[PDB]
Design a protein around this ligand. Structure first.
Ligand SMILES: [Zn+2]
Length: 803
DNA sequence: GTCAGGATACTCCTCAATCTACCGGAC
DNA sequence: GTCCGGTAGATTGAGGAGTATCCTGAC
């Protein structure tokens, strides 16, 4: 097949005849090219590249150019390869020695279609772009290293000051646009279409750039200009969904395909617009859109896959390739290799899914029979972006890591599983004998660093910074390893290296507090966010440095830090939550979703929803107004006066809240017998109208109960947030415990408490309830009497406890 | 014969969120 | 013998990014 691949090119017959003539010496010491490299040049570079590499072989290698055989093939195997090979020979000495470019950067420029043109254009414009527009050598090379690099370089030279000054486009965004093929066209299109897309279509400059920053930016932008109002008005898609499709490579093709297939996929195939857009918003969107359009029924009716599984497979780059591979290969992996269809889909639903699927098909027998891996381990490695690369690396490298360095197969698999597993595996092979000897790290510590996403980067960064962090700042090597042991370890390590002395000298944090923040997944993000927000939270909201660190030192620290700064005003001033309680929520992982969900339910919820949300999160007893006797009405007035609450709020059945006086509420609780009084020890009193006044069904989480007193007073309790003074009690936070403690504080000698819990009352209530009760008091605990138990030593019957 | 542009597929690195086990008193 | 409350380690999903191959049109 490779011979045909050459024969069908513009110089196919000539390249094959020339290659056979010169292969005798291309395989020699000067280059030592193998069969793939020899045909690769003939296929892509053609006859001129084949003759050029041979004829100039004595200058390309063994000369001050130091252009290795692999770099020669990379340059030769392009249209115009002969031209790039001569040009890199002429300019490489100058670009490196005079302009300071790394030989790898010059080769990266040479290894493109039109490499000669990019090489000469960089030689001319590099000092101009750097000195006139502030573009670093890395940015100019990034522009140059493309097909048509010359055109991207010249266009940036002309258009950067126009886009920056006329439209406010950041110079880095101009480079980002010119960082792919067609950079000239994307820049010109942005200049032409920004007035239209931002004014007529209502798109932001960031959205226009995001589209332009991909390959085919001109085509995606022009297509959005035409199709966005059609997709929005005819099919009910939001501008964000149209841009999201356009913001992937090949956006034009996905946009037109959605317009054509969306009404068919929804009406005939039963897919939602969100599923179609999700498929469309990728590279090769149109391919997989049409692929499901035709394979969806087949995979469902013949292969037994659900629409959700097929859409999931289609939602990754190259979705068509994973879809077609599953079509033909699923019955082989599940029958010849015995894999569960869910495992094959799990592999298929990845970037490069076709490659992981085909690799398992051919490689699973080797990893299991030769290297001793289980099918679950091989699938686990396969089900990741780049799974093919990790699988091949394990096959060849595992016995070297195990036999030469003493690692277990499980440690190799653990490294292999993560995205970039190939890179972490090779990096451990190189650095493991250095890290464990030059710095004295334990091999388990190096593996712990390696077994993370981006492990290669953390391994190299520890090798560089470990002897500096432990000396310039005095950190313990264990602290550096701990920082390195999370995804993105390089980023946390570099941030600590530069930022620790600032957080200590300016913000007053200890090195241990800086490490505690750094040792997370979002380490760099939490570290930099604390630097900016700590004095703002402390001065604006009265937080201590310890509270800011407590929020930062978790997963999602940046998100919790900003959310607390954002939501504290409304959470405390409007909803009556204590700032410490908002911090307590933020101190947990996922702090922001928790506070946003609390905000949403407290803002748009009904009186019943706000009562449950506030009581479960804040903690307070609730007194129901159904009993309107003078004795209980006076109890409420007396309890309030003793506390002097700062705010009083009335909550209407529809969820709206008004600021009220105490006198108004005291009248309402007497007249309104469909209401509940919430007495927050923080100094916040609510009156809720229009609630259920009952116990919701037990849903397997925080539950409810009611305490009924002799005089008819009914006190509602929730489980969960208990009394800090009794933390050491294993019944703390239970309805029976809150009832017994309520009776103690209120000198109640008799009460009965009812709760809904279909799993039974836990055994801890059987002795601790009497302890919490004051001497002489009796509490009757009544189960729902609709279930027995879900554990041992549970109470399914009414029991009385006396203090 | 090179060169510019577009579409498509694959691989590597960071960041949150969520999801399970641990781990702790005290009748 | 939780309806509790951290703690560290383990998936699960999503987005930005650098790397790679292929085709088509115009000279
Ligand atoms: Zn209990």
């Amino acid at each position: 097949e490779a011979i045909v691949g050459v024969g069908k090119q513009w110089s196919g017959a000539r390249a094959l005849e020339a290659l056979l003539t010169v292969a005798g010496e291309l395989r020699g010491p000067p280059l030592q090219l193998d069969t793939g490299q020899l045909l690769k040049i003939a296929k892509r570079g053609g006859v001129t590249a084949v003759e050029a590499v041979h004829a100039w072989r004595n200058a390309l290698t063994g000369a001050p150019l130091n252009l290795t055989p692999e770099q020669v093939v990379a340059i030769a195997s392009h249209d115009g390869g002969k031209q790039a090979l001569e040009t890199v020979q002429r300019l490489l000495p100058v670009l490196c020695q005079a302009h300071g470019l790394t030989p790898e950067q010059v080769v990266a420029i040479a290894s493109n279609i039109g490499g000669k043109q990019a090489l000469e254009t960089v030689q001319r414009l590099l000092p101009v772009l750097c000195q006139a527009h502030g573009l670093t050598p890395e940015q100019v090379v990034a522009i140059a290293s493309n097909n048509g690099g010359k055109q991207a370089l010249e266009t940036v030279q002309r258009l950067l000051p126009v886009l920056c000054q006329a439209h406010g486009l950041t110079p880095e965004q101009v480079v980002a646009i010119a960082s792919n093929n067609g950079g000239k066209q994307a820049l010109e299109t942005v200049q032409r279409l920004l007035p239209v897309l931002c004014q007529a279509h209502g798109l932001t400059p960031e959205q226009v750039v995001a589209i332009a920053s991909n390959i085919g930016g001109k085509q995606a932008l022009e297509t959005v200009q035409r199709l966005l109002p059609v997709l929005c008005q005819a099919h009910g898609l939001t501008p964000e969904q149209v841009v999201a499709i356009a913001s992937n490579g090949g956006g034009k093709q996905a946009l037109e395909t959605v317009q054509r297939l969306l009404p068919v996929l929804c009406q005939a195939h039963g897919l939602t617009p969100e599923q179609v857009v999700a498929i469309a918003s990728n590279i090769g969107g149109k391919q997989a859109l049409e692929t499901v359009q035709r394979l969806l029924p087949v995979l469902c009716q013949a292969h037994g896959l659900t629409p959700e599984q097929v859409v999931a497979i289609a939602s990754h780059d190259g979705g068509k390739q994973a879809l077609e591979t599953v079509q033909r290969l699923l019955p082989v992996l599940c029958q010849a290799h015995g894999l569960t269809p869910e495992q094959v889909v799990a592999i298929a639903s990845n970037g490069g899914g076709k490659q992981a699927l085909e690799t398992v098909q051919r490689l699973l027998p080797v990893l299991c029979q030769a290297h001793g891996l289980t099918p679950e381990q091989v699938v686990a490695i396969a089900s990741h972006d780049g799974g093919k690369q990790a699988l091949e690396t394990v096959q060849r490298l595992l016995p070297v890591l195990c036999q030469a360095h003493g690692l277990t197969p499980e440690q190799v698999v653990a490294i292999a599983s993560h995205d970039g597993g190939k890179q972490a595996l090779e990096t451990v092979q190189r650095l493991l004998p250095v890290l464990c000897q030059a710095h004295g790290l334990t091999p388990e510590q190096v593996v712990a660093i390696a077994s993370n996403g981006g492990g290669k980067q953390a391994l190299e960064t520890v090798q560089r910074l470990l002897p500096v962090l432990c000396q310039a700042h005095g950190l313990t090597p264990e602290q550096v390893v701990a920082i390195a042991s999370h995804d993105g370890g390089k980023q946390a390590l570099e941030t600590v290296q530069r930022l620790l002395p600032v957080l200590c000298q300016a913000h007053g944090l200890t090195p241990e507090q800086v490490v505690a923040i750094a040792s997370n997944i979002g380490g760099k993000q939490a570290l930099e966010t604390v630097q900016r927000l700590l004095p703002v939270l402390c001065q604006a909201h009265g937080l201590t440095p310890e509270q800011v660190v407590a929020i930062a030192s978790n997963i999602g620290g940046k998100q919790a830090l900003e959310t607390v700064q954002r939501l504290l005003p409304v959470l405390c001033q409007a909803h009556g939550l204590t700032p410490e309680q908002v911090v307590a929520i933020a101190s947990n992982g996922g702090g922001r979703p928790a506070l946003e969900a609390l905000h949403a339910v407290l803002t748009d919820g009904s009186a019943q929803e706000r009562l449950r949300a506030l009581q479960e999160v804040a903690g307070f007893p609730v007194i129901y107004t159904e009993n309107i006797d003078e004795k209980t009405l006076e109890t409420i007035e007396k309890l309030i006066k003793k506390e002097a609450p700062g705010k009083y709020r009335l909550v209407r059945p529809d969820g709206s809240v008004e600021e009220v006086s105490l006198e108004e509420l005291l009248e309402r609780i007497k007249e309104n017998n469909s209401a509940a009084i919430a007495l927050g020890p923080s100094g916040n009193v609510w009156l809720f109208e229009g609630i259920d006044h009952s116990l919701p069904e037990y849903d397997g989480t925080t539950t409810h109960g009611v305490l009924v007193l002799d005089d008819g007073t009914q006190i509602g309790f929730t489980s969960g947030n208990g009394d800090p003074r009794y933390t050491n009690y294993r019944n703390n936070g239970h309805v029976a415990q809150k009832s017994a403690l309520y009776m103690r504080e209120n000198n109640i000698s008799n009460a009965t408490v009812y709760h809904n819990n279909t799993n039974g009352t836990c055994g801890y209530c059987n002795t601790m309830t009497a302890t919490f009760l004051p001497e002489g008091a009796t509490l009757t605990v009544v189960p729902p009497e609709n279930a027995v138990a879900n554990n041992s030593r549970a109470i399914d019957y009414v029991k009385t406890y006396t203090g």
